[PDB]
Amino acid sequence: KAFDLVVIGAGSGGLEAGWNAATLYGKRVAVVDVQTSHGPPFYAALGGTCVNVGCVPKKLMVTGAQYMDHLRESAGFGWEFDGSSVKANWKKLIAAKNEAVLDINKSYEGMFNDTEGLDFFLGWGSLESKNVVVVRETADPKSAVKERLQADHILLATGSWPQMPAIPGIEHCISSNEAFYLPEPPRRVLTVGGGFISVEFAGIFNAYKPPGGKVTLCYRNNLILRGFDETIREEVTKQLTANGIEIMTNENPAKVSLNTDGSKHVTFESGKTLDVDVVMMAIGRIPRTNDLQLGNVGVKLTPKGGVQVDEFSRTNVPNIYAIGDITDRLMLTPVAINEGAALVDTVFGNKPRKTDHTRVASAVFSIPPIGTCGLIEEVAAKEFEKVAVYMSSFTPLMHNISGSKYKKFVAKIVTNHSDGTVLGVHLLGDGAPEIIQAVGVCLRLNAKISDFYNTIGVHPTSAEELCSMRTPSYYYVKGEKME
Amino acid sequence: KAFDLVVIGAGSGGLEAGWNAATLYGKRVAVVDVQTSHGPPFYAALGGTCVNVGCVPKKLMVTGAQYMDHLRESAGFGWEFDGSSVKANWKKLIAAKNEAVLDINKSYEGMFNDTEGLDFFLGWGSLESKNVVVVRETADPKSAVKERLQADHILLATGSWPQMPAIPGIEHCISSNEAFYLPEPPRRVLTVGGGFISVEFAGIFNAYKPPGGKVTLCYRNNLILRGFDETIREEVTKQLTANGIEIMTNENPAKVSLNTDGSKHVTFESGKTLDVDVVMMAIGRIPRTNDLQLGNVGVKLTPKGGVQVDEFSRTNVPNIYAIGDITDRLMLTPVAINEGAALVDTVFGNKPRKTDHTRVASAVFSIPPIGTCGLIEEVAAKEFEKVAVYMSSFTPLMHNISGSKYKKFVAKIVTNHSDGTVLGVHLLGDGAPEIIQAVGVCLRLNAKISDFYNTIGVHPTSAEELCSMRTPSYYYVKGEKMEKLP
Ligand SMILES: Cc1cc2nc3c(=O)[nH]c(=O)nc-3n(C[C@H](O)[C@H](O)[C@H](O)COP(=O)(O)OP(=O)(O)OC[C@H]3O[C@@H](n4cnc5c(N)ncnc54)[C@H](O)[C@@H]3O)c2cc1C
Ligand SMILES: Cc1cc2nc3c(=O)[nH]c(=O)nc-3n(C[C@H](O)[C@H](O)[C@H](O)COP(=O)(O)OP(=O)(O)OC[C@H]3O[C@@H](n4cnc5c(N)ncnc54)[C@H](O)[C@@H]3O)c2cc1C
Ligand SMILES: COC(=O)c1cccc(NS(C)(=O)=O)c1
Ligand SMILES: COC(=O)c1cccc(NS(C)(=O)=O)c1
Ligand SMILES: [Br-]
Ligand SMILES: [Mg+2]
Ligand SMILES: [Mg+2]
C-alpha cells in the first residue's frame, strides 16, 4: 500500500508527526508499532515508551510512593490512626497503573479507527528501500512479511531501550521495563545508576517495600544526578538518605549470582557485597536502530547507534527523517513531540521550524522532586564572563511541623550578570515540577532577574522564593567562583 | 526619640519598609505595634496579620485539612489501614500552629535588636501632628503616652480588621481571629461569606469536624468567590459540595441566639434556621484608621474608608504615606510588601518606583486550590474589542485512581485576540498556587498565547496544560460571547 508518510514507532514523537501530517496537512499516513497494548514481551507499544513504560506509569507510582510521607507527615497536623494497620499494597498500585495504561492504549486504538488517512500496522518496521517500509512478524529480518508500505516520506521514531552492562549475571538483572511488572514489591532492591530513572524507582521501591525492607542505590561517580544543579544533587542525596535509602556512590556491579534461595548476590567492583531480591539496571538508554535494517538505505548512524540529523530532523537520505530518542539528544516526551510537529510543519507545511533544545523545562519525580530549566552555573560560567547565582535554601515551615525537617526547598537562579538575563532556574522540593513550567515561558521571553524580583509573590508558596531574590549569593568571573 | 521614618504597624508592609530603610539606606526607623506575639487580645502582633492570624497559620491549617483527602485518596494507590481508627486532632494542629507563629514572632524580635536604627515600640500609634507620632498604652486617645516620636516621614501600615454585621446576637459569633484559637473543632459550623477566608475556613473545619459533623457556608448572593473566574467559581462550589460542605447561596443571617446547651440558633433573612456550634463571620475586612486619630492632621480617607493614596503611597499630607490593607485596595501580603519596598526605594533610595496593581498572582487555598493572575474574561471583554478564552478542564488521571473524580483541573487563558497578549490566567486544582507564580512573571513580560504554546511542556504535570492550548474555546467581540469570530 502507498502512503505520503510512514512512521516507524507509534510513540510520543511518531504519533504527534502522524496525527499532524494526517489531520493538519491531509496526508495519507501509516504508523507501525510492535504491540497494541503495554507490557511483556516488548514493553513499549501503541502510545510509546512514556505511555506504556515511562512518564505516565512512573508518575502514578511516584504519586503512590508519596503517601508514605503523607501518612507519616499527617501526624504533625494532628492526624491519628493505627500505624500498625498500615500496608503498601503494591499489587493494587500495579493493577491501577495497568488499567490507566491500557485505557490510553485503547484510546490510541480508537484514534486510528476513527481518523481517516491515519492507518496503524502491527509488527516490526524496517527499511527495505528509501521509499519502502517492510513490516515483519518479529525483529528478525528473516521473519514473515505482513506488509510492504510505499512511502514518499519515512519517519524513524523507534525511541530508545535500556542499556544493560555485559557483565556476568546480567540475565539475573532487570531494567525499568520489568520493574513496572514486578508482581510483588521487593524487600531488598539495588537500583544501579545515578540518573532520574534510578532515583525515581529508588523512591517508588522505598515506599512499597515490605516490612524490614531496604532500598540501595549505587552510582560509579561521587554524586548522583550529573547534569543537575550541584546544590540540588547534594540535597536530594541527603533527603533520599533521610527517608531510608542507602546511597552507594563510587560503586558499580562487577557480577551478579543467585543465592540458593534465588535472591541476587551482588559483587561490587570495590569487592563489597549486597544480597537483594531485585537488581534494577538504570545506567542509560540507547537509540533503537538495530532492527531498522538502516544498512538497506545507508541512513547515517553515530557509533553509539543514534540516527544523525540536521536541526530539521533530516537524515543524509532525502525523504527519511528521525525524531525523538532515536536521535540521542534530549530524551523527553515533549521534545520528541515538538520535533515531530516541527518536522511535519517543515516538510508538509513548508513552515520551516526547528526544535529549540535549549531552555527546556524538565523534572525529576524524586521524593522530593526537582524542576529545572536552562543552564547549571558550572556550564554558564564557561560560556559567560560574569555569572551570578541567586540561592534560597530552607526547610519550609509546613515541614518543621510535619516532622520532615530534612526537606529543604532549594530555589536557584543563574544569570548572565552582565545584563541580568536568566540562564537557568533549578528547584528542589514539593511542587518543583509544577513551578518550573511557566519558568520555561520566562526563559523563552529572555526574562532577567529584575523581571522575577519585580513580580509580586503569591504567598504562601514555595514558588514566591523565585520573586524574592534581589542580591546574588555568589558569582563566577571568567570561570572562577567568588563569594 | 527622633527618627527618619516612624511606621505604625509592624506588619507585612510596615516591616518591609522599616527593614529596607534601615539595612539599605542606613536610615533611623521606629516601628509601633500593639503586641509582640500572636493571639488575644489584639490577635495581630509583631509580624502583622498574615504572620499572626492570616496567610501563615491559615496555610498550615489548610495543609492539615488536606490530609483528610490524602488519607482517603491513598487507598486508590494501594495504601491500606484501619479507616475506623482515623481521628483529626484539632488541639494538636492549633498547638503546632501556635509554636510555628511564636517562632516567627521571636524571629522578628531579633531583627529589631540585631539592626541599628530599627527599633520596636509597644503600644498604640496615633498622629499628634504632621511630624510627631505618640505611642499610648491603649487604643483610647486619653490613655498614657509611653513615647513621643519625631518623624521626618510617617508610614501608616495598620492593616485591616474583620467586619462584623450589626445583627442581634453578633456577640455569639467569631471572626477568623477567634477561629485560630478555638479550643475544640466545631461539629457544626456556619462560615458566613463567599470570599477566600470563608471558603478556606470551610475546608479546614470540614477536615477537623468530629463525627456527625457538618460545615455550612452561606453567601448573600448567588455564587461564591466574586472577582474570580466564573468557571472556577462554579467548579470550587461543586468540589466543596462533593467533599461534604453545604453551600447556602442567596442566604444571610438576620440574627443569632444562644440555645440553652451553648449552641447557636441562626435565623436567616429568608426565615430558614440552622443550629451550629460556631458562626464564623468572614463578610469583609475594613481598614484600621479609627485609632490613628487622622482628624488631628487631616489625612484624607476614601468614600469607602481607606487612606486615600497616589501611586507613590503618598497621602494628602507631605511626609505621611500609607501602604497595605489600610489603603483598602488589594488586601494581599505581597502587595503590602511591594508598596513598602517601592515607598522606601522612592523616598530614601532616590529611585522612585510605583507598585503595579495589575497582573498580580494570588491564590485561594480552597481544597482544591485556585491560582490566578490578571483579568477575568468579563472584565477583559469590557476593555478589549476581541478577547479569546482558551480553556482545558479535566479530572487529572491520578484523581481517577484516587477516587476523587470530582477534582476537575481548570486552566483558562484570557487574551487580547488582536495581538495574542495574555490578559489573565485562572487555574483550579492541586498545585495551582505554585503554577501561577511564574505566570505572574510571564504577564509582566507581556507574554502572548504563542509564548505559552511554543514553550516545551514539563511532562507529566498539570502546568503543561498552559503550554498545550493553541485554539480559543470561545471569544468576546465588543462584550458579546460567541463560539466563533465573524
Ligand atoms: C522509565 C522512564 C521514565 C520516563 N519519564 C519521563 C518523564 O517523566 N517525562 C518525559 O518527558 N520523558 C520521560 N521519559 C522519556 C520518554 O519516555 C521518551 O523520551 C519518549 O517516549 C521518546 O519518544 P519517541 O517518540 O522518541 O519514542 P517512544 O515513545 O519510545 O516510541 C517508540 C516506539 O517505537 C516502537 N518500536 C521500536 N522499534 C520498532 C520497530 N522496529 N517497528 C515498529 N515499532 C517499533 C516501540 O514499541 C515504541 O512504542 C521516560 C523514559 C523512561 C524509560
Ligand atoms: C484569615 C486571613 C488569611 C489571609 N491569607 C492571605 C494569604 O494567603 N495571602 C495573602 O497574600 N494575604 C492573605 N491575607 C491578607 C494579609 O494578612 C494582609 O493583606 C496583610 O497582612 C496586610 O499587611 P499590612 O502591612 O497592610 O498590615 P498587617 O500585616 O495587617 O499589619 C498591621 C499591624 O498593625 C498593627 N496595628 C494596628 N493598629 C495599630 C496602632 N494604632 N498602633 C500600632 N500598631 C497597630 C497590628 O497589630 C498589626 O500587626 C489574609 C488575611 C487574613 C485575615
Ligand atoms: C543480556 O542483557 C540484556 O539484553 C538483558 C538482560 C536482562 C534483562 C533485559 N531487559 S530488557 C530486554 O527489557 O532490556 C535485557
Ligand atoms: C463589632 O465587633 C463585634 O461585635 C464582634 C462580635 C464578635 C466577635 C468579634 N471579634 S473581632 C473584634 O475579633 O472581630 C467582634
Ligand atoms: Br560527580
Ligand atoms: Mg484510520
Ligand atoms: Mg534595633
PDB file of N, CA, C and O and ligand atoms in Angstrom, chain B residues 161-162 164 170 173 175 177-178, ligand 4:
ATOM      1  N   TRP B 161      -9.211  44.712  59.606  1.00  0.00           N
ATOM      2  CA  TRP B 161      -9.851  44.111  60.787  1.00  0.00           C
ATOM      3  C   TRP B 161     -11.161  43.537  60.311  1.00  0.00           C
ATOM      4  O   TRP B 161     -11.766  44.091  59.406  1.00  0.00           O
ATOM      5  N   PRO B 162     -11.608  42.392  60.847  1.00  0.00           N
ATOM      6  CA  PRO B 162     -12.809  41.764  60.333  1.00  0.00           C
ATOM      7  C   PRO B 162     -14.005  42.685  60.569  1.00  0.00           C
ATOM      8  O   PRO B 162     -14.087  43.257  61.669  1.00  0.00           O
ATOM      9  N   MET B 164     -17.904  42.927  61.341  1.00  0.00           N
ATOM     10  CA  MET B 164     -18.949  42.088  61.975  1.00  0.00           C
ATOM     11  C   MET B 164     -20.299  42.763  61.766  1.00  0.00           C
ATOM     12  O   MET B 164     -20.539  43.851  62.298  1.00  0.00           O
ATOM     13  N   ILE B 170     -24.657  39.140  67.358  1.00  0.00           N
ATOM     14  CA  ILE B 170     -23.312  39.168  66.706  1.00  0.00           C
ATOM     15  C   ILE B 170     -22.269  38.778  67.764  1.00  0.00           C
ATOM     16  O   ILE B 170     -21.214  38.210  67.383  1.00  0.00           O
ATOM     17  N   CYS B 173     -20.955  35.245  67.770  1.00  0.00           N
ATOM     18  CA  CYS B 173     -20.235  34.921  66.508  1.00  0.00           C
ATOM     19  C   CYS B 173     -18.746  35.171  66.696  1.00  0.00           C
ATOM     20  O   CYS B 173     -18.344  35.886  67.641  1.00  0.00           O
ATOM     21  N   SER B 175     -14.888  35.847  64.370  1.00  0.00           N
ATOM     22  CA  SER B 175     -14.179  36.148  63.109  1.00  0.00           C
ATOM     23  C   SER B 175     -13.073  35.104  62.936  1.00  0.00           C
ATOM     24  O   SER B 175     -12.902  34.193  63.772  1.00  0.00           O
ATOM     25  N   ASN B 177     -10.188  35.715  63.493  1.00  0.00           N
ATOM     26  CA  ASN B 177      -9.280  35.929  64.651  1.00  0.00           C
ATOM     27  C   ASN B 177      -9.438  34.801  65.681  1.00  0.00           C
ATOM     28  O   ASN B 177      -8.416  34.198  66.083  1.00  0.00           O
ATOM     29  N   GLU B 178     -10.666  34.595  66.153  1.00  0.00           N
ATOM     30  CA  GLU B 178     -11.000  33.592  67.187  1.00  0.00           C
ATOM     31  C   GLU B 178     -10.901  32.188  66.610  1.00  0.00           C
ATOM     32  O   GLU B 178     -10.603  31.237  67.397  1.00  0.00           O
TER      33      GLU B 178
HETATM   34  C1  LIG C   4     -18.047  44.745  66.080  1.00  0.00           C
HETATM   35  O1  LIG C   4     -17.466  43.594  66.744  1.00  0.00           O
HETATM   36  C2  LIG C   4     -18.319  42.698  67.248  1.00  0.00           C
HETATM   37  O2  LIG C   4     -19.460  42.963  67.528  1.00  0.00           O
HETATM   38  C3  LIG C   4     -17.704  41.352  67.423  1.00  0.00           C
HETATM   39  C4  LIG C   4     -18.508  40.259  67.724  1.00  0.00           C
HETATM   40  C5  LIG C   4     -17.947  39.005  67.888  1.00  0.00           C
HETATM   41  C6  LIG C   4     -16.586  38.822  67.756  1.00  0.00           C
HETATM   42  C7  LIG C   4     -15.775  39.900  67.444  1.00  0.00           C
HETATM   43  N1  LIG C   4     -14.374  39.670  67.327  1.00  0.00           N
HETATM   44  S1  LIG C   4     -13.300  40.546  66.463  1.00  0.00           S
HETATM   45  C8  LIG C   4     -13.264  42.146  67.171  1.00  0.00           C
HETATM   46  O3  LIG C   4     -12.023  39.937  66.664  1.00  0.00           O
HETATM   47  O4  LIG C   4     -13.810  40.635  65.127  1.00  0.00           O
HETATM   48  C9  LIG C   4     -16.330  41.171  67.285  1.00  0.00           C
END
